[PDB]
Amino acid sequence: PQITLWQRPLVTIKIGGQLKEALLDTGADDTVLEEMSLPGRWKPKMIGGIGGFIKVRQYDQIPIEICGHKAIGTVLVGPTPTNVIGRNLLTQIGCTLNF
Amino acid sequence: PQITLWQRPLVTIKIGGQLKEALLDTGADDTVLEEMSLPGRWKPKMIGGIGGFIKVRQYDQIPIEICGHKAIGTVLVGPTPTNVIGRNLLTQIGCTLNF
Numbered sequence: 129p130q131i132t133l134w135q136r137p138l139v140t141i142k143i144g145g146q147l148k149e150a151l152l153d154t155g156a157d158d159t160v161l162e163e164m165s166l167p168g169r170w171k172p173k174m175i176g177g178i179g180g181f182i183k184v185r186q187y188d189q190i191p192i193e194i195c196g197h198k199a200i201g202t203v204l205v206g207p208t209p210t211n212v213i214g215r216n217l218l219t220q221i222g223c224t225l226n227f
Numbered sequence: 228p229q230i231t232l233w234q235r236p237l238v239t240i241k242i243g244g245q246l247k248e249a250l251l252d253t254g255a256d257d258t259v260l261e262e263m264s265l266p267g268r269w270k271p272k273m274i275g276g277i278g279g280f281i282k283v284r285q286y287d288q289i290p291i292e293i294c295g296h297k298a299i300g301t302v303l304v305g306p307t308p309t310n311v312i313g314r315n316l317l318t319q320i321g322c323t324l325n326f
Protein backbone atom coordinates (compact mmCIF):
# COMPACT_ATOMS: atom_id res chain seq x y z
CA PRO A 129 0.00 0.00 0.00
CA GLN A 130 0.81 3.67 0.29
CA ILE A 131 1.03 4.56 3.97
CA THR A 132 0.56 8.12 5.22
CA LEU A 133 2.65 9.60 8.03
CA TRP A 134 0.04 11.90 9.50
CA GLN A 135 -0.24 9.10 12.06
CA ARG A 136 2.19 6.48 13.36
CA PRO A 137 2.64 3.77 10.70
CA LEU A 138 1.28 0.82 12.68
CA VAL A 139 0.69 -2.56 11.06
CA THR A 140 -0.34 -6.04 12.15
CA ILE A 141 2.37 -8.68 12.03
CA LYS A 142 2.16 -12.45 12.43
CA ILE A 143 5.07 -14.00 14.32
CA GLY A 144 5.44 -17.16 16.40
CA GLY A 145 1.78 -18.01 15.87
CA GLN A 146 0.78 -14.64 17.33
CA LEU A 147 -0.77 -11.47 15.89
CA LYS A 148 0.82 -8.25 17.12
CA GLU A 149 0.76 -4.53 16.32
CA ALA A 150 4.10 -3.02 15.32
CA LEU A 151 5.62 0.27 14.16
CA LEU A 152 7.28 0.54 10.73
CA ASP A 153 10.51 2.37 11.55
CA THR A 154 12.82 3.36 8.70
CA GLY A 155 15.25 4.66 11.34
CA ALA A 156 15.70 1.31 13.09
CA ASP A 157 18.61 -1.00 12.19
CA ASP A 158 16.90 -3.93 13.88
CA THR A 159 13.47 -5.36 14.63
CA VAL A 160 12.62 -5.35 18.34
CA LEU A 161 9.54 -6.84 19.98
CA GLU A 162 8.29 -6.81 23.57
CA GLU A 163 8.85 -9.94 25.64
CA MET A 164 7.64 -13.09 23.89
CA SER A 165 8.68 -16.68 23.23
CA LEU A 166 10.46 -17.79 20.07
CA PRO A 167 11.95 -21.20 19.13
CA GLY A 168 15.58 -22.03 18.44
CA ARG A 169 18.95 -20.55 19.34
CA TRP A 170 19.49 -17.05 20.72
CA LYS A 171 22.30 -14.82 21.99
CA PRO A 172 22.41 -11.64 24.06
CA LYS A 173 22.75 -8.20 22.50
CA MET A 174 22.74 -4.60 23.68
CA ILE A 175 20.92 -2.18 21.40
CA GLY A 176 20.88 1.59 21.67
CA GLY A 177 18.34 4.34 21.11
CA ILE A 178 17.21 7.61 22.62
CA GLY A 179 17.78 7.35 26.37
CA GLY A 180 20.42 4.64 26.14
CA PHE A 181 20.77 0.89 25.79
CA ILE A 182 18.68 -2.16 26.61
CA LYS A 183 19.63 -5.83 26.63
CA VAL A 184 17.71 -8.12 24.26
CA ARG A 185 17.70 -11.73 23.05
CA GLN A 186 18.65 -12.20 19.39
CA TYR A 187 16.93 -14.92 17.35
CA ASP A 188 17.90 -15.48 13.73
CA GLN A 189 15.98 -16.92 10.76
CA ILE A 190 12.55 -16.12 12.22
CA PRO A 191 9.57 -16.22 9.84
CA ILE A 192 7.35 -13.16 10.02
CA GLU A 193 4.35 -11.88 8.09
CA ILE A 194 3.90 -8.11 7.74
CA CYS A 195 0.73 -6.74 6.14
CA GLY A 196 0.49 -10.18 4.51
CA HIS A 197 4.01 -10.05 3.11
CA LYS A 198 6.16 -12.97 4.22
CA ALA A 199 9.80 -12.50 5.18
CA ILE A 200 12.45 -14.12 7.36
CA GLY A 201 15.11 -12.43 9.48
CA THR A 202 16.53 -11.63 12.90
CA VAL A 203 14.11 -10.61 15.65
CA LEU A 204 15.23 -9.08 18.94
CA VAL A 205 13.10 -9.60 22.04
CA GLY A 206 13.29 -7.54 25.23
CA PRO A 207 11.94 -4.64 27.29
CA THR A 208 11.33 -2.27 24.40
CA PRO A 209 8.52 0.18 25.16
CA THR A 210 6.91 -0.62 21.80
CA ASN A 211 7.11 -3.14 18.96
CA VAL A 212 9.27 -1.84 16.10
CA ILE A 213 9.84 -3.33 12.66
CA GLY A 214 13.30 -2.31 11.45
CA ARG A 215 15.11 -2.11 8.13
CA ASN A 216 16.27 -5.72 8.28
CA LEU A 217 12.68 -6.80 7.57
CA LEU A 218 11.39 -3.68 5.80
CA THR A 219 13.79 -4.43 2.95
CA GLN A 220 12.32 -7.88 2.43
CA ILE A 221 8.77 -6.61 1.89
CA GLY A 222 9.99 -4.02 -0.61
CA CYS A 223 9.25 -1.05 1.62
CA THR A 224 10.60 2.33 0.51
CA LEU A 225 10.38 6.01 1.42
CA ASN A 226 9.03 8.39 -1.22
CA PHE A 227 8.79 12.16 -1.52
CA PRO B 228 13.35 10.48 -4.41
CA GLN B 229 12.63 6.84 -3.69
CA ILE B 230 14.85 5.66 -0.86
CA THR B 231 15.43 1.98 -0.17
CA LEU B 232 16.35 0.69 3.25
CA TRP B 233 19.31 -1.61 2.64
CA GLN B 234 21.37 1.13 4.28
CA ARG B 235 20.48 3.78 6.85
CA PRO B 236 18.27 6.43 5.20
CA LEU B 237 20.77 9.20 5.93
CA VAL B 238 20.28 12.57 4.26
CA THR B 239 21.77 16.05 4.41
CA ILE B 240 19.72 18.72 6.16
CA LYS B 241 20.37 22.44 6.43
CA ILE B 242 19.53 24.28 9.64
CA GLY B 243 20.74 27.71 10.71
CA GLY B 244 22.82 27.88 7.54
CA GLN B 245 24.81 24.73 8.34
CA LEU B 246 24.75 21.26 6.80
CA LYS B 247 24.29 18.16 8.93
CA GLU B 248 23.57 14.47 8.37
CA ALA B 249 20.31 13.10 9.71
CA LEU B 250 18.23 9.93 9.70
CA LEU B 251 14.74 9.75 8.18
CA ASP B 252 12.82 7.96 10.90
CA THR B 253 9.16 7.00 10.51
CA GLY B 254 8.99 5.55 14.01
CA ALA B 255 9.68 9.00 15.45
CA ASP B 256 6.87 11.45 16.28
CA ASP B 257 9.35 14.25 16.76
CA THR B 258 12.58 15.58 15.24
CA VAL B 259 15.59 15.49 17.57
CA LEU B 260 19.00 16.96 16.82
CA GLU B 261 22.31 16.79 18.67
CA GLU B 262 23.39 19.83 20.71
CA MET B 263 23.43 23.03 18.66
CA SER B 264 22.46 26.71 18.82
CA LEU B 265 19.02 27.95 17.78
CA PRO B 266 17.32 31.36 18.05
CA GLY B 267 14.49 32.46 20.33
CA ARG B 268 12.97 30.90 23.43
CA TRP B 269 12.61 27.17 24.09
CA LYS B 270 10.18 25.10 26.15
CA PRO B 271 10.89 21.86 28.00
CA LYS B 272 10.04 18.43 26.69
CA MET B 273 10.61 14.92 27.98
CA ILE B 274 10.78 12.37 25.17
CA GLY B 275 10.96 8.60 25.40
CA GLY B 276 13.03 6.26 23.28
CA ILE B 277 14.00 2.61 23.30
CA GLY B 278 16.47 3.21 26.13
CA GLY B 279 14.41 5.51 28.34
CA PHE B 280 13.75 9.22 28.71
CA ILE B 281 15.73 12.35 27.90
CA LYS B 282 15.13 16.05 28.45
CA VAL B 283 15.29 18.21 25.35
CA ARG B 284 14.91 21.86 24.40
CA GLN B 285 11.90 22.46 22.14
CA TYR B 286 12.27 25.16 19.48
CA ASP B 287 9.24 26.07 17.34
CA GLN B 288 8.87 27.37 13.78
CA ILE B 289 12.47 26.68 12.77
CA PRO B 290 13.27 26.63 9.05
CA ILE B 291 14.97 23.41 8.00
CA GLU B 292 15.84 21.95 4.61
CA ILE B 293 15.69 18.17 4.25
CA CYS B 294 17.27 16.76 1.11
CA GLY B 295 16.60 20.12 -0.56
CA HIS B 296 12.97 20.14 0.58
CA LYS B 297 11.88 23.16 2.61
CA ALA B 298 10.15 22.78 5.96
CA ILE B 299 9.49 25.01 8.97
CA GLY B 300 8.63 23.29 12.24
CA THR B 301 9.42 22.08 15.72
CA VAL B 302 12.96 20.95 16.44
CA LEU B 303 14.08 19.32 19.68
CA VAL B 304 17.70 19.63 20.78
CA GLY B 305 19.40 17.30 23.24
CA PRO B 306 21.48 14.18 23.96
CA THR B 307 20.48 11.92 21.09
CA PRO B 308 22.63 9.13 19.58
CA THR B 309 22.06 10.73 16.16
CA ASN B 310 20.10 13.42 14.36
CA VAL B 311 16.62 12.08 13.69
CA ILE B 312 13.99 13.52 11.37
CA GLY B 313 10.54 12.54 12.64
CA ARG B 314 7.04 12.49 11.22
CA ASN B 315 6.38 16.14 12.09
CA LEU B 316 8.77 17.22 9.30
CA LEU B 317 8.46 14.11 7.12
CA THR B 318 4.81 15.08 6.56
CA GLN B 319 5.86 18.59 5.53
CA ILE B 320 8.14 17.32 2.76
CA GLY B 321 5.47 14.96 1.45
CA CYS B 322 6.92 11.65 2.60
CA THR B 323 5.08 8.32 2.48
CA LEU B 324 5.91 4.65 3.00
CA ASN B 325 5.37 2.36 0.02
CA PHE B 326 5.41 -1.40 -0.49
Ligand SMILES: COC(=O)N[C@H](C(=O)NN(CCC[C@@]1(O)Cc2ccc(cc2)C/C=C\CNC(=O)[C@H](C(C)C)NC1=O)Cc1ccc(-c2cccs2)cc1)C(C)(C)C
Pocket residue numbers: 153154155156157158160175176177178209210212250252254255256257258259274275276277308309311313
Ligand atom coordinates in the same frame (compact mmCIF):
# COMPACT_ATOMS: atom_id res chain seq x y z
C1 LIG C 1 6.61 8.98 20.69
O1 LIG C 1 7.90 8.56 21.14
C2 LIG C 1 8.79 8.62 20.11
O2 LIG C 1 8.41 8.83 18.96
N1 LIG C 1 10.09 8.41 20.35
C3 LIG C 1 11.05 8.28 19.25
C4 LIG C 1 11.65 6.86 19.27
O3 LIG C 1 12.49 6.54 20.12
N2 LIG C 1 10.93 5.96 18.58
N3 LIG C 1 11.20 4.79 18.71
C5 LIG C 1 11.55 4.24 17.39
C6 LIG C 1 13.04 3.89 17.30
C7 LIG C 1 13.87 5.18 17.21
C8 LIG C 1 15.25 4.88 16.60
O4 LIG C 1 15.08 4.59 15.21
C9 LIG C 1 16.06 6.01 16.72
C10 LIG C 1 17.43 5.89 16.47
C11 LIG C 1 18.33 5.89 17.54
C12 LIG C 1 19.67 5.61 17.32
C13 LIG C 1 20.11 5.26 16.04
C14 LIG C 1 19.21 5.29 14.98
C15 LIG C 1 17.88 5.60 15.19
C16 LIG C 1 21.45 5.00 15.79
C17 LIG C 1 22.05 4.33 16.85
C18 LIG C 1 21.98 2.94 17.00
C19 LIG C 1 21.07 2.17 16.28
N4 LIG C 1 19.80 2.12 17.04
C20 LIG C 1 18.61 1.74 16.40
O5 LIG C 1 18.63 1.54 15.19
C21 LIG C 1 17.40 1.82 17.10
C22 LIG C 1 16.72 0.44 17.05
C23 LIG C 1 17.68 -0.62 17.60
C24 LIG C 1 15.45 0.46 17.91
N5 LIG C 1 16.55 2.86 16.46
C25 LIG C 1 15.85 3.78 17.24
O6 LIG C 1 16.04 3.77 18.46
C26 LIG C 1 10.12 4.13 19.15
C27 LIG C 1 9.59 4.53 20.38
C28 LIG C 1 8.30 5.06 20.44
C29 LIG C 1 7.74 5.41 21.67
C30 LIG C 1 8.49 5.30 22.83
C31 LIG C 1 7.93 5.59 24.01
C32 LIG C 1 8.25 4.96 25.15
C33 LIG C 1 7.61 5.42 26.25
C34 LIG C 1 7.06 6.70 26.11
S1 LIG C 1 7.27 7.09 24.36
C35 LIG C 1 9.77 4.76 22.78
C36 LIG C 1 10.31 4.36 21.56
C37 LIG C 1 12.11 9.38 19.38
C38 LIG C 1 13.26 9.15 18.39
C39 LIG C 1 11.44 10.72 19.07
C40 LIG C 1 12.65 9.42 20.81
Ligand SMILES: [Cl-]
Pocket residue numbers: 200201202216217
Ligand atom coordinates in the same frame (compact mmCIF):
# COMPACT_ATOMS: atom_id res chain seq x y z
CL1 LIG D 1 18.10 -10.09 9.41
Ligand SMILES: [Cl-]
Pocket residue numbers: 222231
Ligand atom coordinates in the same frame (compact mmCIF):
# COMPACT_ATOMS: atom_id res chain seq x y z
CL1 LIG E 1 15.02 -3.39 -3.54
Ligand SMILES: [Cl-]
Pocket residue numbers: 299300301315316
Ligand atom coordinates in the same frame (compact mmCIF):
# COMPACT_ATOMS: atom_id res chain seq x y z
CL1 LIG F 1 6.28 20.70 13.52
